[PDB]
Each structure stands twice: as C-alpha cells, then as structure tokens.
Amino acid sequence: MSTAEQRLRLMQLASSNLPVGGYSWSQGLEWAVEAGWVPDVAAFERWQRRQMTEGFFTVDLPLFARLYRACEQGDIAAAQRWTAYLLACRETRELREEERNRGAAFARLLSDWQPDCPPPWRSLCQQSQLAGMAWLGVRWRIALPEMALSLGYSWIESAVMAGVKLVPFGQQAAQQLILRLCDHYAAEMPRALAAPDGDI
Amino acid sequence: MSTAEQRLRLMQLASSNLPVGGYSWSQGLEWAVEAGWVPDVAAFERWQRRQMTEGFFTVDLPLFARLYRACEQGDIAAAQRWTAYLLACRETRELREEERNRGAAFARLLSDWQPDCPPPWRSLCQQSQLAGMAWLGVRWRIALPEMALSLGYSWIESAVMAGVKLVPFGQQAAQQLILRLCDHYAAEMPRALAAPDGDI
C-alpha cells in the first residue's frame, strides 16, 4: 500500500466521523466540570494534559504498542493477554463495557475493510478498538508511531469537542486547544511508546 | 520528513470539525439527488468521482499548488493573480460568495494560529481558504503533496457526510466509500499537481 494511501487511511482512522462513539477517560471531565475544576479554556487544558500523561500515556498507548507488537509477531495468545490487562486497567464495570462497546463498533468496520481478518482477531477486536486498530495497522503495513499519532489525534479531538459542550467554550478556542494539546502529545509520545512493562 | 507535530497539524487541517462551513462542488449533489441521478451509494460514487476529476483536480488542487509555490517565493502579486483566476473558475456569483465565506471563516482561525500572518495574506485568505491553507502550509514547513492529501481527505469526507444526509445512506457504507474515493484520490493527485497552466 502506497505512502499516499497510508496517509489517507490514517486521516480516516483519526476522524471524529469514524462511527465508534465516545472516548476513554471521558467521565473524568463531567465530574471535574461539576466539581468546579474546569471553569475555562486554561483549566480545561491543565485537566486534559493531566489525563493525557496520567491515563492515555500510561494505559491506552503502551497497551496499543504491545497489541501492535503481538500482531506483528503473529502472537494471538499474547494479544489476548494484553487485551485482558487493558480491560483490568479500566477498573469499573461501566468503563470495561464502554471499551467492549467501542470494540464491537470498530469490529463491524474492520471486517468490512478486511474480510481477510481471522475470527480470533475479530473476536479480540470486540474486547477493544485498540486490538482492532493494531491488527489493521499491521495488515496495512503502517509503522506503530504513525498509527499512534492517529489514535492520539482522535482522542485529543474527542476530548476537546466534549469540552466545547461541557465547559463550555467556542469553536475558535477549540482549534487553539487542539494545536497546543497536539504539541504536548508530539513531545511526550516517544517516551510513552518506549516505557517498560513496569510503568503500565 | 514531516515531524510528529506536522502530522498532527495535517489531521487538524483535514478534520470535519474544522469550523469552516461546506465544501466546493457541493451544489451539484442536491440538484443531482432531486433530479433522480443519485439514488444509492454506487450512483453517489460515480457522481463524486466525476466531481473529483472534472472539478477538484482541474481547479482546486492545481490552483492550491500555484498559491503554495507563490507563497514559497514570497510572491504576493502572483498569489493575488492565482486567487483571481480561482474565483473566475467558480463561474456563478453564488459559488464565488461561497468561496469567499469559507475564506473568511478560515482567516479567523489562520490569524488566531499565526498572528504573524501579514495583512496582504490575511486579505487574500478572505478570498479563498486555499490561499490561507497555502500560506499556513509554507509557514508550518509542510511539503505541498502532504497538504494536498489533507485537503483532498477533507473534501472527500465532507462530500460523503453530505451524501449520508441527502441520498441517504448509512455510516458503514460511508466508511467503505471514503476508502475507495481516497484510493482514487491517491492514484490521481500527482498528475493533478504536475498539470501545466493550460490544463486548469
């Protein structure tokens, strides 16, 4: 698959229009708003930088890296074990169910795009969108760091569009926030992708 | 040679959430639906392939390339002349006004992201989003072919999300259509970027 094709696929995986619904760490925000912690754009940025470094970069991204490496090695049993750890890291029953619902939504697309996808991997994708993304990344021969920018962009944009409604703030302020949160994501992603198993 | 920061900026420029309303060649669709030309996904794909090759690849992309080259050279007078030709290529009064409205919407973001944007370029951005995009691409040191994938993905996704509403068709079918239209866009972009002035 050409470099131009890979670029368009990454923008399609990153899109707020991807029909999947919600984002990890989202329940933090409505609590934080109601509690008085996010009155304005500056406080929203502080709150989201903390969710990106304490949640996304300690759980989602490192487990996405391990699912990608497992798929690359053809190691389904390892991908099953990492998906189990991911679900245990979503401590609540409710947040495990949200992870599985997003997985089922993404699996409907995955099997349409690549009918190719073996049943054990489709079954794993229904546990987490991260396992589905990881299989699709390897199938499309897209490097882990590229997939990880598309994952992060999608998460950043979802968190900002939710802030628009909850804080609230406007469309112009949203675009400046996405810019600054993308800068922080680019500076910190490599350390997050390199972190050892002990740091998850 | 795109950095991680540049890759996130390209996904932000590509986003359906960018607060600029509508997309070029859009007016075709409502007429074509009402007229009976676009009953289903297959007919919408035929219609959009024709708009991409006869409109976007003969007008928008080649003039975006010329605006990018003008900005690289610091040639504002050239960028003014190419923007004038772009507006004359929109044909109707209504479609020139739609181009200018999208330009004004993008200029509000451009001047927020880069207050450094000189008045002549801000003024040109209000004529067309393409001139604003072109200045921002050069300012951000993003290669023309990269910006062009982001521009094309945004246009493809806007056309498909409008088809979802107007035809109509569903979210799953939309994702397959974006995939096929992106493949056509990737195959045809380089010829469109290389076309001589006589082919616009």
PDB file of N, CA, C and O in Angstrom, chain A residues 124-172:
ATOM      1  N   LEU A 124     -11.118 -10.766  19.276  1.00  0.00           N
ATOM      2  CA  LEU A 124     -10.300  -9.872  20.138  1.00  0.00           C
ATOM      3  C   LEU A 124     -10.704  -8.409  19.914  1.00  0.00           C
ATOM      4  O   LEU A 124     -10.844  -7.677  20.933  1.00  0.00           O
ATOM      5  N   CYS A 125     -10.958  -7.971  18.675  1.00  0.00           N
ATOM      6  CA  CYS A 125     -11.354  -6.559  18.394  1.00  0.00           C
ATOM      7  C   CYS A 125     -12.623  -6.199  19.168  1.00  0.00           C
ATOM      8  O   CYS A 125     -12.747  -5.030  19.543  1.00  0.00           O
ATOM      9  N   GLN A 126     -13.528  -7.152  19.409  1.00  0.00           N
ATOM     10  CA  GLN A 126     -14.791  -6.886  20.152  1.00  0.00           C
ATOM     11  C   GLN A 126     -14.519  -6.580  21.634  1.00  0.00           C
ATOM     12  O   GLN A 126     -15.449  -6.055  22.317  1.00  0.00           O
ATOM     13  N   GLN A 127     -13.332  -6.931  22.136  1.00  0.00           N
ATOM     14  CA  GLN A 127     -12.879  -6.582  23.510  1.00  0.00           C
ATOM     15  C   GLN A 127     -12.412  -5.123  23.521  1.00  0.00           C
ATOM     16  O   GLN A 127     -12.737  -4.405  24.495  1.00  0.00           O
ATOM     17  N   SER A 128     -11.693  -4.687  22.487  1.00  0.00           N
ATOM     18  CA  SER A 128     -11.122  -3.320  22.398  1.00  0.00           C
ATOM     19  C   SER A 128     -10.823  -2.937  20.954  1.00  0.00           C
ATOM     20  O   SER A 128     -10.166  -3.711  20.254  1.00  0.00           O
ATOM     21  N   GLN A 129     -11.274  -1.743  20.582  1.00  0.00           N
ATOM     22  CA  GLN A 129     -10.876  -0.966  19.398  1.00  0.00           C
ATOM     23  C   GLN A 129      -9.346  -0.955  19.285  1.00  0.00           C
ATOM     24  O   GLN A 129      -8.852  -0.922  18.166  1.00  0.00           O
ATOM     25  N   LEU A 130      -8.602  -0.950  20.392  1.00  0.00           N
ATOM     26  CA  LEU A 130      -7.118  -0.903  20.313  1.00  0.00           C
ATOM     27  C   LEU A 130      -6.588  -2.161  19.624  1.00  0.00           C
ATOM     28  O   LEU A 130      -5.689  -2.017  18.817  1.00  0.00           O
ATOM     29  N   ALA A 131      -7.163  -3.333  19.897  1.00  0.00           N
ATOM     30  CA  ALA A 131      -6.736  -4.618  19.301  1.00  0.00           C
ATOM     31  C   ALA A 131      -7.085  -4.610  17.809  1.00  0.00           C
ATOM     32  O   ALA A 131      -6.268  -5.086  17.001  1.00  0.00           O
ATOM     33  N   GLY A 132      -8.278  -4.137  17.460  1.00  0.00           N
ATOM     34  CA  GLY A 132      -8.696  -3.944  16.057  1.00  0.00           C
ATOM     35  C   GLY A 132      -7.762  -3.001  15.310  1.00  0.00           C
ATOM     36  O   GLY A 132      -7.315  -3.411  14.196  1.00  0.00           O
ATOM     37  N   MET A 133      -7.474  -1.822  15.863  1.00  0.00           N
ATOM     38  CA  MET A 133      -6.572  -0.812  15.248  1.00  0.00           C
ATOM     39  C   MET A 133      -5.205  -1.449  14.962  1.00  0.00           C
ATOM     40  O   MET A 133      -4.682  -1.270  13.843  1.00  0.00           O
ATOM     41  N   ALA A 134      -4.658  -2.140  15.968  1.00  0.00           N
ATOM     42  CA  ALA A 134      -3.355  -2.851  15.998  1.00  0.00           C
ATOM     43  C   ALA A 134      -3.291  -3.894  14.886  1.00  0.00           C
ATOM     44  O   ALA A 134      -2.300  -3.901  14.163  1.00  0.00           O
ATOM     45  N   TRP A 135      -4.338  -4.689  14.706  1.00  0.00           N
ATOM     46  CA  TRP A 135      -4.376  -5.701  13.614  1.00  0.00           C
ATOM     47  C   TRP A 135      -4.381  -4.979  12.265  1.00  0.00           C
ATOM     48  O   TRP A 135      -3.638  -5.365  11.355  1.00  0.00           O
ATOM     49  N   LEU A 136      -5.190  -3.936  12.155  1.00  0.00           N
ATOM     50  CA  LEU A 136      -5.379  -3.184  10.891  1.00  0.00           C
ATOM     51  C   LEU A 136      -4.070  -2.465  10.518  1.00  0.00           C
ATOM     52  O   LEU A 136      -3.679  -2.512   9.336  1.00  0.00           O
ATOM     53  N   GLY A 137      -3.391  -1.884  11.509  1.00  0.00           N
ATOM     54  CA  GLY A 137      -2.076  -1.236  11.346  1.00  0.00           C
ATOM     55  C   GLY A 137      -1.065  -2.199  10.763  1.00  0.00           C
ATOM     56  O   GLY A 137      -0.385  -1.868   9.781  1.00  0.00           O
ATOM     57  N   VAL A 138      -0.972  -3.383  11.338  1.00  0.00           N
ATOM     58  CA  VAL A 138      -0.030  -4.408  10.825  1.00  0.00           C
ATOM     59  C   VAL A 138      -0.492  -4.849   9.439  1.00  0.00           C
ATOM     60  O   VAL A 138       0.363  -4.937   8.573  1.00  0.00           O
ATOM     61  N   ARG A 139      -1.783  -5.110   9.239  1.00  0.00           N
ATOM     62  CA  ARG A 139      -2.319  -5.563   7.931  1.00  0.00           C
ATOM     63  C   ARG A 139      -1.999  -4.517   6.852  1.00  0.00           C
ATOM     64  O   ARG A 139      -1.655  -4.914   5.724  1.00  0.00           O
ATOM     65  N   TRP A 140      -2.069  -3.232   7.184  1.00  0.00           N
ATOM     66  CA  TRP A 140      -1.861  -2.114   6.224  1.00  0.00           C
ATOM     67  C   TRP A 140      -0.372  -1.721   6.150  1.00  0.00           C
ATOM     68  O   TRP A 140      -0.034  -0.875   5.275  1.00  0.00           O
ATOM     69  N   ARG A 141       0.490  -2.335   6.984  1.00  0.00           N
ATOM     70  CA  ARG A 141       1.960  -2.110   6.996  1.00  0.00           C
ATOM     71  C   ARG A 141       2.253  -0.646   7.372  1.00  0.00           C
ATOM     72  O   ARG A 141       3.175  -0.051   6.815  1.00  0.00           O
ATOM     73  N   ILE A 142       1.489  -0.088   8.298  1.00  0.00           N
ATOM     74  CA  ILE A 142       1.705   1.274   8.847  1.00  0.00           C
ATOM     75  C   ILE A 142       2.512   1.124  10.134  1.00  0.00           C
ATOM     76  O   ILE A 142       2.104   0.314  11.006  1.00  0.00           O
ATOM     77  N   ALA A 143       3.614   1.871  10.245  1.00  0.00           N
ATOM     78  CA  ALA A 143       4.503   1.879  11.430  1.00  0.00           C
ATOM     79  C   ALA A 143       3.700   2.256  12.682  1.00  0.00           C
ATOM     80  O   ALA A 143       2.796   3.138  12.603  1.00  0.00           O
ATOM     81  N   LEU A 144       4.062   1.661  13.813  1.00  0.00           N
ATOM     82  CA  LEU A 144       3.409   1.893  15.124  1.00  0.00           C
ATOM     83  C   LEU A 144       3.337   3.382  15.465  1.00  0.00           C
ATOM     84  O   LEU A 144       2.287   3.837  15.920  1.00  0.00           O
ATOM     85  N   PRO A 145       4.428   4.173  15.340  1.00  0.00           N
ATOM     86  CA  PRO A 145       4.396   5.592  15.690  1.00  0.00           C
ATOM     87  C   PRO A 145       3.383   6.387  14.859  1.00  0.00           C
ATOM     88  O   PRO A 145       2.754   7.266  15.390  1.00  0.00           O
ATOM     89  N   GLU A 146       3.205   6.040  13.587  1.00  0.00           N
ATOM     90  CA  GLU A 146       2.159   6.666  12.720  1.00  0.00           C
ATOM     91  C   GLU A 146       0.759   6.338  13.262  1.00  0.00           C
ATOM     92  O   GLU A 146      -0.015   7.301  13.409  1.00  0.00           O
ATOM     93  N   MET A 147       0.423   5.070  13.471  1.00  0.00           N
ATOM     94  CA  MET A 147      -0.909   4.656  13.999  1.00  0.00           C
ATOM     95  C   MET A 147      -1.219   5.430  15.293  1.00  0.00           C
ATOM     96  O   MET A 147      -2.372   5.861  15.493  1.00  0.00           O
ATOM     97  N   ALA A 148      -0.201   5.577  16.134  1.00  0.00           N
ATOM     98  CA  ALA A 148      -0.194   6.208  17.484  1.00  0.00           C
ATOM     99  C   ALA A 148      -0.488   7.702  17.386  1.00  0.00           C
ATOM    100  O   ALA A 148      -1.112   8.210  18.298  1.00  0.00           O
ATOM    101  N   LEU A 149      -0.079   8.384  16.318  1.00  0.00           N
ATOM    102  CA  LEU A 149      -0.455   9.802  16.096  1.00  0.00           C
ATOM    103  C   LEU A 149      -1.946   9.876  15.737  1.00  0.00           C
ATOM    104  O   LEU A 149      -2.657  10.779  16.214  1.00  0.00           O
ATOM    105  N   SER A 150      -2.425   8.960  14.915  1.00  0.00           N
ATOM    106  CA  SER A 150      -3.849   8.910  14.513  1.00  0.00           C
ATOM    107  C   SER A 150      -4.731   8.610  15.743  1.00  0.00           C
ATOM    108  O   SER A 150      -5.750   9.312  15.924  1.00  0.00           O
ATOM    109  N   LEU A 151      -4.316   7.684  16.608  1.00  0.00           N
ATOM    110  CA  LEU A 151      -5.001   7.325  17.874  1.00  0.00           C
ATOM    111  C   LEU A 151      -5.076   8.566  18.774  1.00  0.00           C
ATOM    112  O   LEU A 151      -6.142   8.850  19.332  1.00  0.00           O
ATOM    113  N   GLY A 152      -3.933   9.228  18.941  1.00  0.00           N
ATOM    114  CA  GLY A 152      -3.795  10.373  19.843  1.00  0.00           C
ATOM    115  C   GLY A 152      -4.597  11.554  19.335  1.00  0.00           C
ATOM    116  O   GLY A 152      -5.228  12.215  20.156  1.00  0.00           O
ATOM    117  N   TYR A 153      -4.521  11.845  18.037  1.00  0.00           N
ATOM    118  CA  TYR A 153      -5.268  12.963  17.417  1.00  0.00           C
ATOM    119  C   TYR A 153      -6.762  12.750  17.691  1.00  0.00           C
ATOM    120  O   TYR A 153      -7.410  13.654  18.175  1.00  0.00           O
ATOM    121  N   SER A 154      -7.289  11.580  17.365  1.00  0.00           N
ATOM    122  CA  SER A 154      -8.707  11.193  17.619  1.00  0.00           C
ATOM    123  C   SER A 154      -9.089  11.414  19.094  1.00  0.00           C
ATOM    124  O   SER A 154     -10.161  11.954  19.378  1.00  0.00           O
ATOM    125  N   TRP A 155      -8.252  10.978  20.022  1.00  0.00           N
ATOM    126  CA  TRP A 155      -8.516  11.123  21.477  1.00  0.00           C
ATOM    127  C   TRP A 155      -8.515  12.608  21.854  1.00  0.00           C
ATOM    128  O   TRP A 155      -9.399  13.041  22.601  1.00  0.00           O
ATOM    129  N   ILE A 156      -7.530  13.362  21.374  1.00  0.00           N
ATOM    130  CA  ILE A 156      -7.418  14.815  21.680  1.00  0.00           C
ATOM    131  C   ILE A 156      -8.669  15.518  21.152  1.00  0.00           C
ATOM    132  O   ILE A 156      -9.317  16.251  21.928  1.00  0.00           O
ATOM    133  N   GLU A 157      -9.000  15.285  19.883  1.00  0.00           N
ATOM    134  CA  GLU A 157     -10.143  15.980  19.262  1.00  0.00           C
ATOM    135  C   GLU A 157     -11.447  15.613  19.986  1.00  0.00           C
ATOM    136  O   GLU A 157     -12.270  16.497  20.173  1.00  0.00           O
ATOM    137  N   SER A 158     -11.659  14.350  20.348  1.00  0.00           N
ATOM    138  CA  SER A 158     -12.872  13.922  21.096  1.00  0.00           C
ATOM    139  C   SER A 158     -12.952  14.668  22.435  1.00  0.00           C
ATOM    140  O   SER A 158     -14.065  15.090  22.808  1.00  0.00           O
ATOM    141  N   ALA A 159     -11.826  14.788  23.156  1.00  0.00           N
ATOM    142  CA  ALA A 159     -11.808  15.418  24.493  1.00  0.00           C
ATOM    143  C   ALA A 159     -12.163  16.908  24.334  1.00  0.00           C
ATOM    144  O   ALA A 159     -12.968  17.419  25.123  1.00  0.00           O
ATOM    145  N   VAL A 160     -11.648  17.550  23.292  1.00  0.00           N
ATOM    146  CA  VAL A 160     -11.890  18.999  23.050  1.00  0.00           C
ATOM    147  C   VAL A 160     -13.361  19.225  22.653  1.00  0.00           C
ATOM    148  O   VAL A 160     -13.951  20.171  23.267  1.00  0.00           O
ATOM    149  N   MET A 161     -13.940  18.415  21.769  1.00  0.00           N
ATOM    150  CA  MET A 161     -15.335  18.588  21.279  1.00  0.00           C
ATOM    151  C   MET A 161     -16.348  18.391  22.420  1.00  0.00           C
ATOM    152  O   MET A 161     -17.428  19.010  22.370  1.00  0.00           O
ATOM    153  N   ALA A 162     -16.014  17.541  23.397  1.00  0.00           N
ATOM    154  CA  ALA A 162     -16.745  17.309  24.668  1.00  0.00           C
ATOM    155  C   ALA A 162     -16.598  18.545  25.575  1.00  0.00           C
ATOM    156  O   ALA A 162     -17.612  18.993  26.117  1.00  0.00           O
ATOM    157  N   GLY A 163     -15.393  19.098  25.682  1.00  0.00           N
ATOM    158  CA  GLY A 163     -15.138  20.352  26.424  1.00  0.00           C
ATOM    159  C   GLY A 163     -15.955  21.512  25.870  1.00  0.00           C
ATOM    160  O   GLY A 163     -16.486  22.299  26.676  1.00  0.00           O
ATOM    161  N   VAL A 164     -16.046  21.617  24.538  1.00  0.00           N
ATOM    162  CA  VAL A 164     -16.892  22.636  23.842  1.00  0.00           C
ATOM    163  C   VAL A 164     -18.274  22.623  24.493  1.00  0.00           C
ATOM    164  O   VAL A 164     -18.801  23.715  24.778  1.00  0.00           O
ATOM    165  N   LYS A 165     -18.850  21.436  24.693  1.00  0.00           N
ATOM    166  CA  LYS A 165     -20.238  21.304  25.211  1.00  0.00           C
ATOM    167  C   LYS A 165     -20.252  21.541  26.728  1.00  0.00           C
ATOM    168  O   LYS A 165     -21.161  22.206  27.191  1.00  0.00           O
ATOM    169  N   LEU A 166     -19.294  20.994  27.478  1.00  0.00           N
ATOM    170  CA  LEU A 166     -19.413  20.869  28.959  1.00  0.00           C
ATOM    171  C   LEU A 166     -18.890  22.118  29.664  1.00  0.00           C
ATOM    172  O   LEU A 166     -19.417  22.447  30.701  1.00  0.00           O
ATOM    173  N   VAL A 167     -17.862  22.783  29.152  1.00  0.00           N
ATOM    174  CA  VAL A 167     -17.182  23.841  29.945  1.00  0.00           C
ATOM    175  C   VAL A 167     -18.071  25.078  30.082  1.00  0.00           C
ATOM    176  O   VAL A 167     -18.235  25.565  31.195  1.00  0.00           O
ATOM    177  N   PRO A 168     -18.674  25.665  29.014  1.00  0.00           N
ATOM    178  CA  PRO A 168     -18.333  25.396  27.611  1.00  0.00           C
ATOM    179  C   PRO A 168     -17.242  26.348  27.097  1.00  0.00           C
ATOM    180  O   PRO A 168     -16.853  27.216  27.822  1.00  0.00           O
ATOM    181  N   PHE A 169     -16.820  26.189  25.848  1.00  0.00           N
ATOM    182  CA  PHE A 169     -16.000  27.189  25.106  1.00  0.00           C
ATOM    183  C   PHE A 169     -16.345  27.053  23.610  1.00  0.00           C
ATOM    184  O   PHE A 169     -17.103  26.163  23.235  1.00  0.00           O
ATOM    185  N   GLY A 170     -15.824  27.952  22.790  1.00  0.00           N
ATOM    186  CA  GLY A 170     -16.264  28.120  21.391  1.00  0.00           C
ATOM    187  C   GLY A 170     -15.343  27.413  20.408  1.00  0.00           C
ATOM    188  O   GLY A 170     -14.291  26.859  20.831  1.00  0.00           O
ATOM    189  N   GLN A 171     -15.694  27.485  19.131  1.00  0.00           N
ATOM    190  CA  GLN A 171     -15.026  26.737  18.026  1.00  0.00           C
ATOM    191  C   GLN A 171     -13.598  27.239  17.825  1.00  0.00           C
ATOM    192  O   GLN A 171     -12.702  26.400  17.587  1.00  0.00           O
ATOM    193  N   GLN A 172     -13.393  28.546  17.915  1.00  0.00           N
ATOM    194  CA  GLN A 172     -12.056  29.173  17.741  1.00  0.00           C
ATOM    195  C   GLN A 172     -11.138  28.692  18.867  1.00  0.00           C
ATOM    196  O   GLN A 172      -9.990  28.292  18.590  1.00  0.00           O
TER     197      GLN A 172
END
